[PDB]
Amino acid sequence: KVFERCELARTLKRLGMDGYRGISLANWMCLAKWESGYNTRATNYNAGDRSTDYGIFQINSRYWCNDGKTPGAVNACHLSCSALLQDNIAPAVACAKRVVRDPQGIRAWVAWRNRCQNRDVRQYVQGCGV
Question: 94 phi and psi, to 5 degrees?
């Protein structure tokens, strides 16, 4: 599914992402925007290390979900990577929460640093009633 901006913002708020481990909702919005364009079925293969990025938050198979074909990988979220391609984002949200519980926090995603860190991110939630 391809979410509309305000629909996603309301969904994430309900799922308790606003302020999770100090990350504002607008940051999570900025991340989903640049990682997948708010698309839950997005997948990106990394030919370089044989891992794959899955779903709305482009979560990596080397550490977070099991896809079976990534060498020397772990599954910290305890999920099949398939779970991250559903229209229902609850499993993807639970995994993203697990990712930020690690020391790097939101910085774990390079796209966040390039596109969201130190910028005016209010734009992503403006007028959504969140």
Answer: -60, -35
Which 3 state secondary structure label does DSSP give 29? Answer: helix
Helix H or strand E segment including 43: strand 43-46
Domain that holds residue 78: 1-130
**Lookup: tokens for 49:** 């290390």
* Residue 38 CB contacts under 8 Å (≥ 6 apart), including other chains: 2, 3, 4, 5, 8, 32, 56
Non-local (6+) Cβ contacts of 110 within 8 A are none
Q: Are 27 and 106 in contact (CB under 8 A)?
A: yes
The experimental method is: X-ray
Domain count, the chain: 1
The catalytic residue positions are: 35, 53
**Residue 79 to residue 75: CA distance in whole angstroms:** 7
* CATH number of domain containing 1: 1.10.530.10
